[PDB]
Amino acid sequence: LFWRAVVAEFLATTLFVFISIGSALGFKYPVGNNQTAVQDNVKVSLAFGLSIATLAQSVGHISGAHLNPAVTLGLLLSCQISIFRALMYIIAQCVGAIVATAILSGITSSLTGNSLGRNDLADGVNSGQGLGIEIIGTLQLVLCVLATTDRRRRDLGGSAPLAIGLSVALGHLLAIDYTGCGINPARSFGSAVITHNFSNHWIFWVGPFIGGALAVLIYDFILA
Amino acid sequence: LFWRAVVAEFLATTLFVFISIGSALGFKYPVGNNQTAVQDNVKVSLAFGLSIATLAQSVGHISGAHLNPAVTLGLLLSCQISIFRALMYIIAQCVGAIVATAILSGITSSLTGNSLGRNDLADGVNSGQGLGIEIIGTLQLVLCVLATTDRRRRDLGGSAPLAIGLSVALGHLLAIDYTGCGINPARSFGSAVITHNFSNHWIFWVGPFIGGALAVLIYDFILA
Amino acid sequence: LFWRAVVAEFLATTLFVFISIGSALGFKYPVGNNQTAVQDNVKVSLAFGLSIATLAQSVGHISGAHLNPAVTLGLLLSCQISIFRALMYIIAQCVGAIVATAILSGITSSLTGNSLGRNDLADGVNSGQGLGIEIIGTLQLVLCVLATTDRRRRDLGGSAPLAIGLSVALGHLLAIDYTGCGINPARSFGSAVITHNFSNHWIFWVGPFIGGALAVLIYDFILA
Amino acid sequence: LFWRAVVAEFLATTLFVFISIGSALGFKYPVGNNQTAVQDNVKVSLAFGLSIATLAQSVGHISGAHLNPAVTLGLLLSCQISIFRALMYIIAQCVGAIVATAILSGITSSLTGNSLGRNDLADGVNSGQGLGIEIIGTLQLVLCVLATTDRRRRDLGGSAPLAIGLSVALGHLLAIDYTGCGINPARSFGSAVITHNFSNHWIFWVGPFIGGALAVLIYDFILA
Numbered sequence: 001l002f003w004r005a006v007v008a009e010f011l012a013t014t015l016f017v018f019i020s021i022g023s024a025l026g027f028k029y030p031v032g033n034n035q036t037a038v039q040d041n042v043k044v045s046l047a048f049g050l051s052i053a054t055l056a057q058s059v060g061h062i063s064g065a066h067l068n069p070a071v072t073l074g075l076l077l078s079c080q081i082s083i084f085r086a087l088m089y090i091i092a093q094c095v096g097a098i099v100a101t102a103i104l105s106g107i108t109s110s111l112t113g114n115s116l117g118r119n120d121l122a123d124g125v126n127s128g129q130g131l132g133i134e135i136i137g138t139l140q141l142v143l144c145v146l147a148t149t150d151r152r153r154r155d156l157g158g159s160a161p162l163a164i165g166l167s168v169a170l171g172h173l174l175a176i177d178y179t180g181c182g183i184n185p186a187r188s189f190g191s192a193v194i195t196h197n198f199s200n201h202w203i204f205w206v207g208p209f210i211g212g213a214l215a216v217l218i219y220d221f222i223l224a
Numbered sequence: 225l226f227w228r229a230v231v232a233e234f235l236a237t238t239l240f241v242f243i244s245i246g247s248a249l250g251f252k253y254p255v256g257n258n259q260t261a262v263q264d265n266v267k268v269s270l271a272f273g274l275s276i277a278t279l280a281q282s283v284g285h286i287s288g289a290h291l292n293p294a295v296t297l298g299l300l301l302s303c304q305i306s307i308f309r310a311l312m313y314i315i316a317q318c319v320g321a322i323v324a325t326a327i328l329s330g331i332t333s334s335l336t337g338n339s340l341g342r343n344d345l346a347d348g349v350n351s352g353q354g355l356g357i358e359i360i361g362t363l364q365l366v367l368c369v370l371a372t373t374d375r376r377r378r379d380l381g382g383s384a385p386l387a388i389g390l391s392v393a394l395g396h397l398l399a400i401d402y403t404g405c406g407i408n409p410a411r412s413f414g415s416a417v418i419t420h421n422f423s424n425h426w427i428f429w430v431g432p433f434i435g436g437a438l439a440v441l442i443y444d445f446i447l448a
Numbered sequence: 449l450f451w452r453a454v455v456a457e458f459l460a461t462t463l464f465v466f467i468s469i470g471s472a473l474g475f476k477y478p479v480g481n482n483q484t485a486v487q488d489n490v491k492v493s494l495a496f497g498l499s500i501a502t503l504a505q506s507v508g509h510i511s512g513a514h515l516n517p518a519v520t521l522g523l524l525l526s527c528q529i530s531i532f533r534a535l536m537y538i539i540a541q542c543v544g545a546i547v548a549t550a551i552l553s554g555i556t557s558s559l560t561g562n563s564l565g566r567n568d569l570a571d572g573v574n575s576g577q578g579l580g581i582e583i584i585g586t587l588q589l590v591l592c593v594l595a596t597t598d599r600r601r602r603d604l605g606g607s608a609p610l611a612i613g614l615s616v617a618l619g620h621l622l623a624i625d626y627t628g629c630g631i632n633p634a635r636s637f638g639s640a641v642i643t644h645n646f647s648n649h650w651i652f653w654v655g656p657f658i659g660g661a662l663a664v665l666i667y668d669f670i671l672a
Numbered sequence: 673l674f675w676r677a678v679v680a681e682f683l684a685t686t687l688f689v690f691i692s693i694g695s696a697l698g699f700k701y702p703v704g705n706n707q708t709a710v711q712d713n714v715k716v717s718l719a720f721g722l723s724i725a726t727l728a729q730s731v732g733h734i735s736g737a738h739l740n741p742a743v744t745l746g747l748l749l750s751c752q753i754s755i756f757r758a759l760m761y762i763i764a765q766c767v768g769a770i771v772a773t774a775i776l777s778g779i780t781s782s783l784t785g786n787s788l789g790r791n792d793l794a795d796g797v798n799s800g801q802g803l804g805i806e807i808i809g810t811l812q813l814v815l816c817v818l819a820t821t822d823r824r825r826r827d828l829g830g831s832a833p834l835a836i837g838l839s840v841a842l843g844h845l846l847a848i849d850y851t852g853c854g855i856n857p858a859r860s861f862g863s864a865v866i867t868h869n870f871s872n873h874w875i876f877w878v879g880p881f882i883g884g885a886l887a888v889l890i891y892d893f894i895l896a
Binding site: 011037047055106 | 710
């Protein structure tokens, strides 16, 4: 266990990153002409949410299933009041995120035309002021898992860890609208690592910090 | 509590309005040319249904999850026979609806081309006679939550408040067909408040009143 | 009760027929030019499956939720061996189906261009030999509800009557491919009643009879 | 029973193959011109996942619902350590797969234009090196059912065999991207049997063997 959840965690994210990119890039590949699809990226949404549940994150992990950066942090902070010690799973997550973005490459990059661009760069058209969207989309999932963990004795009766996989699935469909491609950090860090140009602004990282911070203050406005 | 459910309620709708508009307007934004999508508004459907469930409307609220105007009223009326006192949650809802439409603006409006048109105006092509559709789509959700609250001991066994989020999700896909954009009141009031032209006819508000009234009379045709 | 389930049943189908047609016709309505969509009819699928569940078919009805013609019959036959008396719900269903197709008209027909064509006529391109598809799609739902009613003590644990609403939702997406528009009888009878041309061949009705007959013989190949 | 699960198994796959092909080919059929759709094959995903659940694979079968080749094997191997005897269900599956691809033909082939091409041949553009994708998509389902069977006492509470039907539904949407059409063996064997050209490379069969082998080694990295 002194390393197990971490490896298992690194394992998940890894495939998730390959899953997402597979779907995102997949478009226009043969020696044909442009087509451009919008229902593809919405597919990325679901897929990513499924790979998460497919983890069997029961014993193999801890009460929280797969957790992307911003989320990872968001939960451990609101879950830790009396004290402030639980960064391990965070470090674990980021690490696993890095490797995930390492394996992503593969044949995809070899067979692509000069200009692939694995991910966004300036998302749509808006100066460093159009970062409000991603902020709201971040408290969604953050709040989805928060709510899911809190309310219990009087909610439903049991279903399956798809709940989050579908909610994050939609936040994605809302964020990837035309600007803000790359909700959480991970997905974008590994994008700017290989075949990049650097000018990520990590604007998307400064978002969730305020967002996840906002969804934590809002959830405290309930009980204790 | 002498204000809590109201704030919590105002809170929900708020984000929901930003969620919906985000998805609806999101289309054609860059300095590119027309494209026009129809699978986008269907996305609005789901998204809106998710933000509702994401509320954890257990203790934080009362047995009914988020409730849009027409619905809000529809339930409290059929739930209240012996007497007629339970308008508070209604006032609460409308209020929260107003603020929701206030925050909607944001960067969206600043970066849009002169003619945005946040929402419908005369929905498709039909005089003040083409309001039957929205009426039927309104008793759907109204009846979804009504049925969900009534039948219990012999129904299923427990799932999650997505049920309504998917049913309303489809009513939307049926209403937003080409005419009647803006099922419930809320979404349209806040639309005609900022950057408008006034000629909403609130036709959509005169609908649900008859619709929700119809689904209440039809549900009485069962037990008591 | 000497009429209740029947009225309640007539009630359901009614709205379902209006729901479906609303979605099917909805396309290309304004004074614009052609566009033709294929993701719309797939919407019809889900919608129809939802209106079914929205029935609260517990006490108000009997163990089988809404049931379209071919299905209606299919269940009562396999459910009745020792004897052969349970046609009442069948007559009920067809009747309710007729009224459903009566109200369908409305504004839709008034504002449409000469050539609406509420439904199929010769579905795609194939003589009276291309009826195998609809046959297979019919045993799907028929078998969905059959299986759902049989296996119990060792299956899941309880969910919601969406199961059928999604399975029929897909059979539809498979049938309405390009030929065989109008899975069960109902939907097509009411189509050829108003603004028709008569040449339905009811081929779709001769299908399910063999189909539902086939799925009944196949389910007997299990226990007893 | 000395033949029952096998017939029942042959039965399932059969319809599944007809289901899938129905959806895949369905596009561009009338005497009209090209259109080419991408949201159709994603429909194949779900449909296939539904026909599986529709099996009522409780007593009629064994703990594993329908199981396609690669999967069939993948489970029986990880389920059998102490010994190595449980190939019967495997032989059964492949057999049923063969007949499934026999009935697939039908009217479809008679009314199609010379060049139908029931399935892929060289999937997209990539030498015998672009087989990594299908490998990853294979451990998905393989791992979905593996995880679903393992973790129990602390997971959810009961739902329905759609879980796999939706996960495989997405793996499909990820694989059928543009290359690797035909996830598991079955679907492709029966494709190269009727109206073929032979040059399948079964590359897709050499994949899952490594994939399913990989997902078995990864799941052992947990408990025992």
